[PDB]
Design a protein around this ligand. Structure first.
Ligand SMILES: [Br-]
Ligand SMILES: [Cl-]
Ligand SMILES: [Cl-]
Ligand SMILES: [Cl-]
Ligand SMILES: [Cl-]
Ligand SMILES: [Cl-]
Ligand SMILES: [Cl-]
Ligand SMILES: [Cl-]
Ligand SMILES: [Cl-]
Ligand SMILES: [Cl-]
Ligand SMILES: [Cl-]
Ligand SMILES: [Cl-]
Ligand SMILES: [Cl-]
Ligand code: NA
Ligand code: NA
Length: 129
């Protein structure tokens, strides 16, 4: 499913991401825009053989099982495919684990390079939230 900007912002808020570990909704919407252009089915293969999945492009080396990333963990206890669902619940729950990991949203390279320090509130402007 390709979310609308405000549609995703509402979904993320409903699932408790707004100010989760101190990160305002704009930050999560911005991260999703640049990770996946709001497409739950987005996937990208990494040089190391791992693959990133979903709206927030969560990686199979640590966080989900895809059956093809040798000697990886599955800290979110999910198949990576769950991260491609029109229902963002598994992506949200796994993202909460990741942002809790110690580097906050710096876990998402695109967040650090494209969102951090910017006016991220822009990403929820005009939304009924
Ligand atoms: Br509020
Ligand atoms: Cl947009
Ligand atoms: Cl915000
Ligand atoms: Cl993979
Ligand atoms: Cl990741
Ligand atoms: Cl394969
Ligand atoms: Cl593959
Ligand atoms: Cl594997
Ligand atoms: Cl393995
Ligand atoms: Cl949803
Ligand atoms: Cl953290
Ligand atoms: Cl932090
Ligand atoms: Cl409201
Ligand atoms: Na894995
Ligand atoms: Na695996």
């Amino acid at each position: 499913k390709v979310f609308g900007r405000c549609e995703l912002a509402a979904a993320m808020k409903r699932h408790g991401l707004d100010n989760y570990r101190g990160y305002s909704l704009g930050n999560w919407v911005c991260a999703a825009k640049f990770e996946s252009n709001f497409n739950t089915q987005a996937t990208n293969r990494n040089t190391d053989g791992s693959t990133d999945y979903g709206i927030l492009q969560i990686n199979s080396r640590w966080w989900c099982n895809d059956g093809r990333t040798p000697g990886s963990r599955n800290l979110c206890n999910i198949p990576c495919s769950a991260l491609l669902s029109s229902d963002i619940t598994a992506s949200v729950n796994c993202a909460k684990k990741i942002v809790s990991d110690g580097n906050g949203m710096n876990a998402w390279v695109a967040w650090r390079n494209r969102c951090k320090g910017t006016d991220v509130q822009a990403w929820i402007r005009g939304c009924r939230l």
